[PDB]
Amino acid sequence: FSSLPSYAAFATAQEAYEQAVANGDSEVVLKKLKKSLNVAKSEFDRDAAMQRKLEKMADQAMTQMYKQARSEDKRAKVTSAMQTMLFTMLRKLDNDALNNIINNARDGCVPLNIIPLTTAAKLMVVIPDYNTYKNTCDGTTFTYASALWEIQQVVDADSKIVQLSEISMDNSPNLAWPLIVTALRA
Amino acid sequence: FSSLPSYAAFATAQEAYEQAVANGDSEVVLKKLKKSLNVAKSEFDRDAAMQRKLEKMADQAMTQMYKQARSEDKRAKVTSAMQTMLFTMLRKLDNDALNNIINNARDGCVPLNIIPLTTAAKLMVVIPDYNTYKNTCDGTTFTYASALWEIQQVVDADSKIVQLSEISMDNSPNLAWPLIVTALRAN
Amino acid sequence: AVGACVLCNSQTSLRCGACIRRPFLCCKCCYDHVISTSHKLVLSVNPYVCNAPGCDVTDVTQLYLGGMSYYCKSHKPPISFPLCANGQVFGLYKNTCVGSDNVTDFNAIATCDWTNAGDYILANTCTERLKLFAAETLKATEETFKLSYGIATVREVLSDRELHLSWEVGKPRPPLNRNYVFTGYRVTKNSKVQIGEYTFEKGDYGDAVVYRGTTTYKLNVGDYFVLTSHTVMPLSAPTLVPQEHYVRITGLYPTLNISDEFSSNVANYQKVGMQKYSTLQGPPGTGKSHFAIGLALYYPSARIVYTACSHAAVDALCEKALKYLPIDKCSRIIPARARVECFDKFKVNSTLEQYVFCTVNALPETTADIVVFDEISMATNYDLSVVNARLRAKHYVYIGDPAQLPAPRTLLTKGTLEPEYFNSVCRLMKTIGPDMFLGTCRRCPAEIVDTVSALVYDNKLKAHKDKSAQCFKMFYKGVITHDVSSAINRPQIGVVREFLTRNPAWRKAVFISPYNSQNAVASKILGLPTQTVDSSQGSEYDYVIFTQTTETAHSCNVNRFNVAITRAKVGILCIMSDRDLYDKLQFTSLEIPRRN
Amino acid sequence: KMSDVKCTSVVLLSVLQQLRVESSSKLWAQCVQLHNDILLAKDTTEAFEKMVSLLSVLLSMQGAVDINKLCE
RNA sequence: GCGGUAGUAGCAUGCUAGGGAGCAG
RNA sequence: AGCUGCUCCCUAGCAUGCUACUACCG
RNA sequence: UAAAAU
Ligand SMILES: [Zn+2]
Ligand SMILES: [Zn+2]
Ligand SMILES: [Zn+2]
Known part of the structure; x- marks a missing residue:
């Protein structure tokens, strides 16, 4: 602290005492330098002790409003930060088994149930367009989740069976397309 | 801080002191009217700092009796609530069946564990798997607690209805498995 | 109490309180708005007044930050700072502020009167943020102007619902239509409590006006009817989402053999689905509206929602839908208001119907696959933001013709509004070109x-x-x-x-x-x-x-x-x-x- | 490398739970068991199998807009 | 020059009250 | 949504204690 | 001075 008003008065008082102690004058006129200088150390230290408390209420309001703002913005964005965190960590993981199903899933090829692990349960995945059908179904083997599944039943949106030999480039425009391929793991 | 018997005394003392400082005649003036901020601030200490605690203690007394009033209202609210609960709970039991079993007690008191056994009018079975449903509530009427109960409304963990036609053995692996069969007492 | 600046979208907490809509402004932008406008009130975490008891100075450019409060210069503390200083005002996040130089158009929108054509002409050539700002402030200005109208009281009783009223002399009397309503209050001595809302109708002779009461409170001689006003809710989503193209059809699966009656629309039905949103402008009474339900059944499994700003429009197109689609069709129009009533089909409360028909102001907040907004020549940027806010869907389709009728816009009283500036999508259709064109009459002689x-x-x-x-x-x-x-x-x-x-x-x-x-x-x-x-x-x-x-x-x-x-x-x-x-x-x- | 997949499985189950997946007891039981079994794994090749099985649950329903969060 | 009360400012301790968080059985 | 035990941190009040300097008396 | 809102 410094530039406070009463600091001027206290500074002039102690400068007057500097002058008196350099001159070495009278001691009874020195009763003006401890009956009017000690009046300064209390005309000031009661105005320096009223910005020391304001300067503390400022801090304990600042440090509280800050966290009251954040601690509330944090809770108003969980359903959208959790997802970005999830996919950041997934991309960083780097595993082709997951990258395959994620990419596939981008281009509307999702599964319809939990991918099973047994060497014999079923998997039913959707296939929306032909250019998808080519890259994955070569004959009767299905390449999903970095494995090989033997295709057993294709069935279009008609909910009626489609023959596997009927699916090709030319005759494609006729099938209700989003299909549901069913298969079993190798 | 303003309209007290001491502020005006200090005011007139320092007014006389103003007159005496504008004069500046003798050192007796200086002494006798420096005895005017030396005598008029004790009263400005007492009757201007004392009542700075009067308001303190009055306001804390006020807040304490505020909180006591609120804490005496919440008591009334909770006792009304629990009285309502007690009186709405008995409006479900005063069957003549309960009086029938109490009047046969050779004393007037009966174990508690048998009252819902012999006087309730609704049973609820919770069944883990199909093999247990087979042995217990199989069909649409079964017998338990020496009485004959009849099934109506069957639900599942998600609490969505189920018909007894779906509860077969090959369709069993397609339901939320703890089923909750609610039956009534049929005579 | 924090937001984003209306011009540069930086962090801030200042609002120019003298502006009617109280928009957030950053430091530099608020300084620029207040150094050149009669608006000189600001509100941060707390209002910027001289906090000395009895002082009422409020001009920000002369206020001073004191101890835990802001003080007039007369009531200044020994230690203090000036708030407006060095081309900025003091708020939160001061040194991380970006200053956009759109203060000209911003001041134009803020101080305009919406009375001459230039105001609307500049309302629809600014950025999207300013677009929404101008939209809501214009609607606010109009519906607060509505307050300057006159008031009516009783004069004598004549029946149970046709009576004689007294309009207050000297101020404008509101028009007499069943959408201008006044709430009625009786003031006996004592006794000034609501008695209901009323809508009136001038019957067979004067000065009698038949009326409709919300409840059968027997009318006496001391009551009056004062017009009840409305509020405006601020907007969020833009007028139109940015476009994206594709290389193959997404989300929609066509058909081959249903009702070739919609013959020439197939290549166009695809182009609808291979974009993010498109527009179809059509001369009066042609393949429009027809096209809507045609695309609807061309994509049978496709969830589609229909909308328009005028009730008769959504009703007529719901009729034309009934003419062709499975039912399996609902028009979630209005529960019980807009006293000129409408359809007779189904439901207003389910939103699983594949085909929903309504009017913009009453839309529910649903998901969809296609939204077919109709007659964009009658809607304003406000309404477009309303639809883009409530619904989200995959594609959007707008159909209309700018050469027909615009929005009334009551207060404008000099100049003419070319269709280019009716709203956003009309501009889009006439600036580069309806991205879809169909023009020959099927209907009228x-x-x-x-x-x-x-x-x-x-x-x-x-x-x-x-x-x-x-x-x-x-x-x-x-x-x-x-x-x-x-x-x-x-x-x-x-x-x-x-x-x-x-x-x-x-x-x-x-x-x-x-x-x-x-x-x-x-x-x-x-x-x-x-x-x-x-x-x-x-x-x-x-x-x-x-x-x-x-x-x-x-x-x-x-x-x-x-x-x-x-x-x-x-x-x-x-x-x-x-x-x-x-x-x-x-x-x-x-x-x-x-x-x- | 296994700590990576364990923390990722924590984040995944939390997302699934935020998407109201515990409204169907069968699905929630399946995911809960896959999660607790991943956390107790002790060789990083079983964990990835159960992680692909667990992520299939999120890839099934259409509530998370995958093409957007995959802006890379 | 010192004893007594009455003050302000500063300091330490201790105790009550209130709130937040961490570990253990 | 439990019963305990220990520890850190922040705030408030009071009295006590302590010290400095100012006013009244002895 | 034209439409018309839990
Ligand atoms: Zn302004
Ligand atoms: Zn700005
Ligand atoms: Zn002032």
């Missing part, structure tokens, strides 16, 4: 399409459906019995009086007039169920009866003439004051005693 295409459009219409029966006797219209600013002329009705029964087979025509009150005069001495030219626009009938007024700038509007004549099947008539429109008119001239 070939000759009248020749008439309309001869005048509003350069001639580019053809169709079928020929004669007969069209007439324009240039009919003198007598006394303009003008109670409200909506015109009334019954000597003109002397022609349906000249043709009441001599039309022995012309029994189900449709009567439309530019003025609402003279149309209630068609509801005064009755000939047939009548409509307005605004409740038309997306509605078609067989034979049409029409009455005008004097050659006011109102009825003389060529666009309302367009949307009045182009809504028939094979017959119409035009009874016009007519200085040169019967020199526009391509029909057979008739006279008043010419009944054969």
Whole structure:
């Protein structure tokens, strides 16, 4: 602290005492330098002790409003930060088994149930367009989740069976397309 | 801080002191009217700092009796609530069946564990798997607690209805498995 | 209490309180707005006033930050800072502030009066943020102006619902329509409590006005009816989402063999799905609306929602939907208001119906696959933001024609609004080009399409459906019995009086007039169920009866003439004051005693 | 490398739970068991199998807009 | 020059009251 | 949504204690 | 001075 008003008065008082102690004058006129200088150390230290408390209420309001703002913005964005965190960590993981199903899933090829692990349960995945059908179904083997599944039943949106030999480039425009391929793991 | 018997005394003392400082005649003036901020601030200490605690203690007394009033209202609210609960709970039991079993007690008191056994009018079975449903509530009427109960409304963990036609053995692996069969007492 | 600046989207906490909508502004932007405008009030975490008891100085540019509060210079503490200093104002996040130099257009929007064409002309050529700002502030200005109207009280009781009122003298009386409502309060000595809302109707003679009460409180002599105002909710989503293209059809799966009646629309049905949003502009009564349900069944599994700003429009297109689609169709229009009621189909509370029909202000917040907003020539940027906020879908499709009717915009009283500036999507359709074009009449007589295409459009219409029966006797219209600013002329009705029964087979025509009150005069001495030219626009009938007024700038509007004549099947008539429109008119001239 | 997949499985189950997946007891039981079994794994090749099985649950329903969060 | 009370400012301790968070059985 | 035990941190009040300097008396 | 809102 410094530039406070009463600091001027206290500074002039102690400068007057500097002058008196350099001159070495009278001691009874020195009763003006401890009956009017000690009046300064209390005309000031009661105005320096009223910005020391304001300067503390400022801090304990600042440090509280800050966290009251954040601690509330944090809770108003969980359903959208959790997802970005999830996919950041997934991309960083780097595993082709997951990258395959994620990419596939981008281009509307999702599964319809939990991918099973047994060497014999079923998997039913959707296939929306032909250019998808080519890259994955070569004959009767299905390449999903970095494995090989033997295709057993294709069935279009008609909910009626489609023959596997009927699916090709030319005759494609006729099938209700989003299909549901069913298969079993190798 | 303003309209007290001491502020005006200090005011007139320092007014006389103003007159005496504008004069500046003798050192007796200086002494006798420096005895005017030396005598008029004790009263400005007492009757201007004392009542700075009067308001303190009055306001804390006020807040304490505020909180006591609120804490005496919440008591009334909770006792009304629990009285309502007690009186709405008995409006479900005063069957003549309960009086029938109490009047046969050779004393007037009966174990508690048998009252819902012999006087309730609704049973609820919770069944883990199909093999247990087979042995217990199989069909649409079964017998338990020496009485004959009849099934109506069957639900599942998600609490969505189920018909007894779906509860077969090959369709069993397609339901939320703890089923909750609610039956009534049929005579 | 924190947000984003309206110009540069930086962090801030300052609002220019003198502006009606209280928009967030950053430091530099608030300084620029307040150094050049009469707006000099600011509000941060707490208002910026001189916190000395008894002082009321509020100009920010002269206030000073003191101890835990802001102080006048007269009431300044020994230690303090000036708030407005060095080209900025003091708020949160001061040294991380970005200053956009759109303060010119911002001040234009903030201090304008929406009275001359320049205000709307600049409302729809700024950035999207300023676009939404101008939209909500304009609606706010209009509905707060509505407060300056007059008030009415009782005068004497005459019946149970037709009585005599007293409008307060000296201030404008509001128009008399069933959407201008006043809440009624009785003030006895003592006793000033609500008695209900009311909507009125001027019946058969003066000064009587039949009325409709929200509850049967028996009206006395001491009550009054004061108009109840409305509030405005701020916007969030933009007017139109940014476009994305694709290389293959996404989300939608076509068909091959259903109802080739929509034949020429297939290649266009694909182009709809291979984009993010597209527009179809169409001359009056062509393949529009038809196209909507055509694409609807072309993509059968596709969830689709339909919308328009005018009730009669959504209802007429719900009818045209009923004509073709599985039912399996609902029109979630309105639970129980807009007292001119509508459909008779299903539900307003389910939102699993594959086909939902409603009006913009009453949309529920649903997911969809296609949103077919209809007649964009009648909507404003406000409404477009409303739809883009409530719904999200995959594709968007807008259908309309800027050459027809715009939004009324009551307060504008000098200049003209070209369709380019009706809203955002009309601009888009006329700046680069409707990205989808269809233009030849299916509906109304070939000759009248020749008439309309001869005048509003350069001639580019053809169709079928020929004669007969069209007439324009240039009919003198007598006394303009003008109670409200909506015109009334019954000597003109002397022609349906000249043709009441001599039309022995012309029994189900449709009567439309530019003025609402003279149309209630068609509801005064009755000939047939009548409509307005605004409740038309997306509605078609067989034979049409029409009455005008004097050659006011109102009825003389060529666009309302367009949307009045182009809504028939094979017959119409035009009874016009007519200085040169019967020199526009391509029909057979008739006279008043010419009944054969 | 296994700590990576364990923390990722924590984040995945939390997302699934935020998407109201515990409204169907069968699905929630399946995911809960896959999660607790991943956390107790002790060789990083079983964990990835159960992680692909667990992520299939999120890839099934259409509530998370995958093409957007895959802006890379 | 010192004893007594009455003050302000500063300091330490201790105790009550209130709130937040961490570990253990 | 439990019963305990220990520890850190922040705030408030009071009295006590301590010290400095100012006013009244002895 | 035209449409018309849990
Ligand atoms: Zn302003
Ligand atoms: Zn800014
Ligand atoms: Zn001031």
